[PDB]
Symmetry: D3
Subunit: 78 residues, 6 copies
């Protein structure tokens, strides 16, 4: 779960950002659904859910974790 997510983050995470309870992950062109999917599958306790577009993922942080702390965690697995 977590090791698959980690590898794919290393492959596919271009950048991260945050606002409030939200991390925003940028990926290459066809890649966001695929990444989002590995995140969901990892089922992180600090994560409520994810929604992907083509090249963007919204990851919803579980309180009290913030979007910034979620995004920092994702950075440090890449």
């Amino acid at each position: 779960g977590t090791d698959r997510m980690a590898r794919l983050l290393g492959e596919l995470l271009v950048s991260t950002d945050d606002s409030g309870n939200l991390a925003v992950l940028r990926t290459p062109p066809g890649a966001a659904h695929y990444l989002a999917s590995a995140i969901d599958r990892a089922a992180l306790p600090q994560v409520v859910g994810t929604i992907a577009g083509d090249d963007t993922i919204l990851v919803v942080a579980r309180e009290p974790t913030t979007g910034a702390q979620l995004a920092g965690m994702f950075e440090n697995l890449r």
Copy 2:
């Protein structure tokens, strides 16, 4: 209207979660768009909008309703 919505939540709502102003609903694979659409057509005053993925819907709550209160409402409709 709200009728179809309540009937679909009965059939399709697997689980709820929340964070901040967001309710995150989970459905069977391939059902999230269809349920999201029903929730839009109901046009509930406490919902601003929804975004569906394949089995996840992010519901944005209208202030002052929280994601938790929103999740609590979808869950008691079935």
Copy 3:
């Protein structure tokens, strides 16, 4: 000229705007959300963190301390 294209497309495709918290919620005609959302990305506004589109609706994430209501009124006035 990313902003001008965004401005042109808001004029054409934006049906309604709304908000909650750090989120602006934009509505478009069916099939148009993804196209407008990418024009908004392309424009790289200082106060926008990112966007996610469905079929007819866009979530636009405001950069703190800009709020979703602020982003919404700004999109609204570009219509």
Copy 4:
């Protein structure tokens, strides 16, 4: 599998059409993914696969069944 499919065709199938090995199914807005996935889970021997947009499903007929034969089959099931 096939009960669920046939029930959903009853609710959601608005119209059919065909060309060659292809059946085109129309649904109400937001209904096509849900219907498409019911069809997939039913695993019909005459179906090769499906792709859904918002209100349109492309069903690929297994040779020698035509798109017209596949479309006629889907209609008589409503």
Copy 5:
């Protein structure tokens, strides 16, 4: 309806191609769904339906029109 389709093909159609009863239209990424919807709404007599990816559209030709024929016609509307 057809005018909007014509105007959009002029802005969004990058290239055209075909195979059998199929026209394949290419767009910029993020623009396929929007174009397909405009094609759909124009309801051309020789088009059975469309399905959009991200930057590609499958247009289904109504027999006896071919994909090459459709693609020619779309091509000359740019």
Copy 6:
């Protein structure tokens, strides 16, 4: 381009099937757009294009290549 596609098919391709000028490829849920962009970026001479659903890809074969031939080729690259 082709080497990346070849790596991805080994990881993501679950089954191949076909009908007429179409190869139908199945991946795990959430992997189809990712594999489909890699197929596109390989630009194979015999492929007109691809459209991805959630776990299904339609690959359009270039006349006179058939979908069965494309499918058998993709199958042997796992």
